[PDB]
Amino acid sequence: MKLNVDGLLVYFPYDYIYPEQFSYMRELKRTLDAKGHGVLEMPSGTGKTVSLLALIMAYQRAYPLEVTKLIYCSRTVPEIEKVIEELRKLLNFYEKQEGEKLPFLGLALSSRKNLCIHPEVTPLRFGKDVDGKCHSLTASYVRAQYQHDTSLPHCRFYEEFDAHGREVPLPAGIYNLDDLKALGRRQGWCPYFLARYSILHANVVVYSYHYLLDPKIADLVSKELARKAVVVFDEAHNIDNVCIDSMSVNLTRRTLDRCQGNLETLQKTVLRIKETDEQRLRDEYRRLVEGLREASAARETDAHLANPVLPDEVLQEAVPGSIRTAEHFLGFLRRLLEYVKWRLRVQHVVQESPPAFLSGLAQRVCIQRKPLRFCAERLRSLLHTLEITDLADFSPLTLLANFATLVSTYAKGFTIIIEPFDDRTPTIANPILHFSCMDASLAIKPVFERFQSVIITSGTLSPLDIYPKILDFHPVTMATFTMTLARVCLCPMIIGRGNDQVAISSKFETREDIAVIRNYGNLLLEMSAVVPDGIVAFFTSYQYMESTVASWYEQGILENIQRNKLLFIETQDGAETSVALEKYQEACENGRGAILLSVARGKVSEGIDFVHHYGRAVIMFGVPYVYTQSRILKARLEYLRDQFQIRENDFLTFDAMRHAAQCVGRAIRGKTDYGLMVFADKRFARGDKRGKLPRWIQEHLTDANLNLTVDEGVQVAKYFLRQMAQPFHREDQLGLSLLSLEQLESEETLKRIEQIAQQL
Amino acid sequence: LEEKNRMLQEDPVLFQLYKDLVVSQVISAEEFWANRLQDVGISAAFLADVRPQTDGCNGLRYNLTSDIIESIFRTYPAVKMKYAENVPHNMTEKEFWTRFFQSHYFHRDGVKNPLLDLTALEDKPLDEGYKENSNAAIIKRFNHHSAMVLAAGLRQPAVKRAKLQESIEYEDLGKNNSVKTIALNLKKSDRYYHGPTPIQSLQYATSQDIINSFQSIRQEMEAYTPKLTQVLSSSAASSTITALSPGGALMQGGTQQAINQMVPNDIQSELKHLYVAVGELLRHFWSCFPVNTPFLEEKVVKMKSNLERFQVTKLCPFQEKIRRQYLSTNLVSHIEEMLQTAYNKLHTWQSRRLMKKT
Lengths: 760, 358
Ligand code: SF4
What we know:
The PDB classes it as dna binding protein/dna. Chain A is of the alpha/beta class and 760 residues long.
């Protein structure tokens, strides 16, 4: 289907388009006209990805110069696969419509774990082990030695790409990760290096946030990215959490022990190699004194231990001669590690700013800021110059060096928290140091200041002003697209009163209440006896969920629920949770009622999507407020209050509502997809809490369903299920919620579409 | 043989029929039985619902049933191993069940890649640098029991691509053909207007004299006056009464005879038995018919031989039994009609077969 969007032709691969999709296209085009960052809110299951891809392809076809390359940022690998499939379908439609294969190149980027074919590395269960094995088999210095001696360790997968894979770029088209692996097997090449080589040529490149947001991994992609590149963020409502996790550092006593052991091993190796060849140390000193640009720029294959965290200004400055010597730097690292371990001896939690810790270290160990600034450079150079293969055992040393480099240069927005005792079990000796970053905008600041425009979309975007404050920027367009439905597919209800009229709440003071647990059990039993097989229940914490399950078993209410429908409970084990999900889906598709129990912060709420027959019922047991005992969260709240005038309670409410919407928003995949939404808490009735719900969900939240009872909720569920289970025809959607070729051309419909979106 | 004897005992009339057909050498047991010749799913409530029946007089009624034990074995293969390793030597069954009740075992209180591989859902798996036991046990054993029940219910890039296609495809923006119908349009619709009704001698009237008669009656009834005396007369009334009188032409026939007393109930029951036997024999005969394979010819010949033997050995004694009482009912006439119809059918088919060959 061909569409006219403000004078730009759009090749829609499907026969019909939602009016909200047309509004999204028009607003996205307007954002592209300003070449600036923009935030848009689109309901999930509306095919916004198809519209975005179509508009980007139209922009590239009309003017390749304006959008030199498309950057897509996602959350999980299956999201990348789905985006690749959708873009492949769109490209096939383009080729059929135009009659020729367009010179379009699409590529999906992932880790070496998803792009290695070497048989020895395949059984490895961990990416870091995979990376270490690959580097041991693909070290630059080892490559020449293998050329001089075949029996020496090597990886022909990279060698053939170096010999043959560089010359001829891949043909225009779209390749999946499995497709890339198959092509690499066909050519005997490694798809990882080939994909990185072809990034400069690919029109569209898709990968995850950490591949670009993390400064440690920023240069692995940004080196082949120009100023006019356009980035896309999808379902990035937790982007601040990702940035904080990337910029946060954790240190433990076992980490210190491993660091000491690896440092002693490194010193022994240095002495041994000096005995074998002292000239290596002199050559390293020559490299340091003459400039760091020679070693880093001439070896692009050594990107295993790249640390682009430091700004470009720090790169020019050289390491002081006090630590240029390898042995001097080893002693410096030993002193730093001993000082850190002694500082960890405190028996209580200590909260400190980076400048104070740096001043204390300078007073004690006579360590200035400038020598510590270039710690990462010396670390990387020393690791490279010693032909170290099994770098996995040396990971704690690299982590400590990166932490020291962060402290030496990054001060504002960071907090050092020392907790010698576990929050859960203070009796257990767990001395843990946390270098926590409270400024996520620093991770996204280079993205804003380097790329032409940034596009962020998500289904849970209730506040449109907190994100410009959280990300510390001013988006060009802040538009929310309301959802228009000819048939109601969502039935949000709030039940703050149980059968015994108990005030239903999930406050940790009331989370241990037996009455709340029993009312939850009764609600779940009635829902299982009434609602169809697909039932998912999101709790507030793992311990609370386990205690509630135990209480239900003791009461016996859980037994009746098992009698009605099969139950599956997730644990902290990944394999057990995977088996539980598989069994849940199999039971739901086999006609036997299956109930899943998870947490709002668990993996289920992160990257699991529910189809119409899976997302029949989603029940949130109270507003998921994060357990405040983590002083990192408290410190972040204090920093936000002191830097953005944001109340800590308001931020907690926003985060809890965001998690709840993420848990609920994944149950609808289209107009014909209808599901049930239950919120079992009286606190949801609060205007501040209720007003923090997505517009497409909050609008449909009828006030008649506000603070219902268990039986009232059951009756409303019965009514909604019977209403929506009746057969429906897509023709009814024509002109009301679905637009054909002729209906979109109506000027009245265009005015209606313009009225649909709202800019704030 | 024992199973066949028990089944025959379950149907004594058939057993009597089997005797009258085999002992009289009418049909062989092989030919007799030539034409003569439940699993329960696994429920998850078989544990919570099933309780040791604690009758008030200190009665521990286990109500041990085979299906319950089979469900336990299917859901818990370990219980089957325990049963096979203990009884009948190490311990008794009831003691094993009692131990199971007292043990903590009773009183306990991914093929798809995209949306199952939770370990592989993240591309950044770095190190850890960047009544809880009772609850965990309860959750683990509940999940194990659910998986066991699901498994007992039953008793590659292509798969990933198929799963992705199923997940992404939208029913709205696809195809809605649904035209699995065949239209029908007959040639001549006038067949039904005069259907199975045979051709009637629907004679047409004469020439314009028909119009003259129509005009005559039109004028005759155009000036009409109602009459009362002319409507009926006593003589006409007497004739109508006589026609409606008992024994009249309208009163066809009259009283009949009590057939029930004309035949003994034993003779009636034997007639029912013979009716059922001949009916089943002829049903098998017609099932063989039409003879489309050479094997059917021998089977129908055997059927006719069996019919002849049964007739001679039963109806002829039955005919004599009826004739000794000199019953006026021709009950045997119906059987003779059926037998002769079948015999003539077979003879005619044999004649057709001979004609086709020649
Ligand atoms: S070169 Fe490629 S195939 Fe070989 S170990 Fe490294 S990632 Fe794996």
